[PDB]
Assembly symmetry: D2
Homo-oligomer: 215 residues x 4
């Protein structure tokens, strides 16, 4: 794992049965927990749903881990790891996502599948009334020899208020790696620039691991 790495990805998926595809390129510093990328809609544009539901699917290797917390993700390379996630929104909209992450030289390669269902037509997702994800705190922990990650967060809405979502992620390293203890990863994901119909999106994330209070 080098101080400066690259990212290459393609997402294929569907929302309420309507398919789309997105590709991206970016860069980041795994030891600083920061990353950025440019995403382009390749199929299914203009997307008829809020782009925000996709952003957290677009790699916990980009998280600053302190010395005293075992780093599952940086350990998993060069072989890599995969993850599966269900994102259950409070109005019944559900998104299932998978990412198979490999490494080629200094570039991480993502193979992503995304499938969302049951988003109501008048809801904030289909009507594109989301502003941004709030900062969040993920709760990791081991179960049956694999790493799990839970984070219940929310999207701020146009006229104020919040639209909640529960994340449940399973992380699976390619090879056996040292498993960590119960810890946290704080997140802050932001869309810094985009064109009108989100065909082009510049996305950033900042993430740091910690163990909660005393600090």
């Amino acid at each position: 794992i080098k101080p400066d790495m690259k990212i290459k990805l393609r997402m294929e998926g569907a929302v309420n049965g309507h398919p789309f595809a997105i590709e991206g390129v970016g860069l980041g510093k795994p030891f600083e927990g920061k990353q950025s990328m440019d995403l382009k809609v390749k199929e299914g544009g203009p997307l008829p749903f809020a782009y925000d539901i996709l952003t957290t699917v677009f790699n916990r290797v980009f998280a600053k881990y302190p010395e005293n917390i075992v780093d599952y993700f940086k350990q998993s390379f060069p072989e890599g790891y995969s993850w599966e996630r269900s994102m259950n929104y409070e109005d019944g909209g559900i998104c299932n996502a998978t990412n198979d992450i490999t490494l080629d030289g200094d570039c991480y390669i993502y193979e992503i599948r995304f499938d969302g269902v049951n988003f109501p037509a008048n809801g904030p997702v289909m009507q594109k009334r989301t502003v941004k994800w709030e900062p969040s705190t993920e709760k990791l922990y081991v179960r049956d020899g694999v790493l799990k990650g839970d984070v219940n967060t929310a999207l701020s809405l146009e006229g104020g208020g919040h639209y909640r979502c529960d994340f449940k992620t399973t992380y699976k390293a390619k090879k056996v790696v040292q498993l960590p203890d119960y810890h946290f990863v704080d997140h802050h994901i932001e869309i810094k620039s985009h064109d009108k119909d989100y065909s082009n999106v510049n996305l950033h994330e900042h993430a740091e691991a910690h163990s909660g209070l005393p600090r």
Copy 2:
């Protein structure tokens, strides 16, 4: 539009825990008797490493006997057809999202199905294939925001006894505006009647009848 004897043709593309597969099927049924059967063949991703039972309820409420006093949303929706979306949340956290776009070509219904399941534990009854069958169930149907919803929480019986629960949440969307029904129910019973060892071939049956529950 609906004939007493119809045919079914389908293809499902999907993935379970990130591992892709594909299944095609042909079948037949009687929409007015609420009965149907089909033969399914795994075309890609075999041998399937998960319990086939998680697929079966994705493999058409037009095959449901509707009484006269209950509006039939599904038979009304043809020849144009309808689509549906469904989330299947299992009690151990495994979740399956599925969609079906149903069209009609002559006397044959055509299904375009996508199926995506995640977070099934390796030690669980799905990945370990220790499910026996779905129990009979009762779906609850109601209108919300101009479309028809269907909720049913049911369970799979397990090898050594016991049950593995799952909550279904389906949204039915007719392609044309049709008359919306009142709150009602649909009883179900789905069964795998035959299959080879690795479920490459599966003969699947379903019986369904609509009703209004216990009277006032």
Copy 3:
């Protein structure tokens, strides 16, 4: 131990959003016909500031017609009786936890009921009293760790149309060892047949029949 005509006496103590209340009731029913009725009167905490409908399904599966081919967990449990626990999760986050300890004195069932609901929003149908009635329902009963479980998703019809859903999760506990049944169903239909303006007095009815689903009905 169970006669064709039995009587009912109960007292419920509870709270909704921290506001306590108490209700007592008397009634009668036919256990083998799955029918019952009762008169309930608010004794404390009136006038109730929440929709009465959230209480009704807490106000006894012994009042359900069981066919001969389905094992009756509840009629077996008497004269000793049984208890049950339930959580009712409404789709807007309102949660009600309830318990009922059911005893028998002669031909009268005695209920000791606790009811606690929290997180009902002020603008919701419960606090705004916008519920009409429970729809008919189909409960699912199955065994887990030697006790009988009962799950039912149902809904309340609302005053301007639409439905307000709720998930029931009930655990039934016989006081003595009884024969456990297989996976089966119980159809329900509960109705408020009469009530005064502030629901100080309520006449409540329930009809329930067990079955094994399709084929048949």
Copy 4:
């Protein structure tokens, strides 16, 4: 209204799986440091047949260190006080509903607490008393319909390793009109400091600090 050192007096009445109990406690804390401690005494229903840990987070966000840039909903609410309601939904189906009416008498906060837990399985970690402690947690507070909400998904560490998860959903209600805060967080760490064999006596501690997340 809030001084650097305050006292705590409380009584909890409740039931778990239909079995009633009652607990009273006295304690003290520093609201501006986000720290508190208390001694609790089982008065009725002892010896408690369930894991004491399910009660501890019910035994006051006034004891949370709020930075200057984040509006303090709780310190504003006194001397009139505030109340809160909570449902705690454990991953095996055990559900606990709790309420606390918090008043102020001089320098002492007074809690009137009700606690009701249901559907805890006999073979589960609660009824088998296999919990070790709550992990540290991060609560998220946000406004909905003019009142303050608090959500936290956390877990209890267990006896042979592993974790037993629980989702908290809290509604905070000030008795008078106060300034509402923006979306923010409160980190928690609750610990039983000492206890006797059957938990009839328990010394409990909590440390809490509010923050706005990354970066900090």
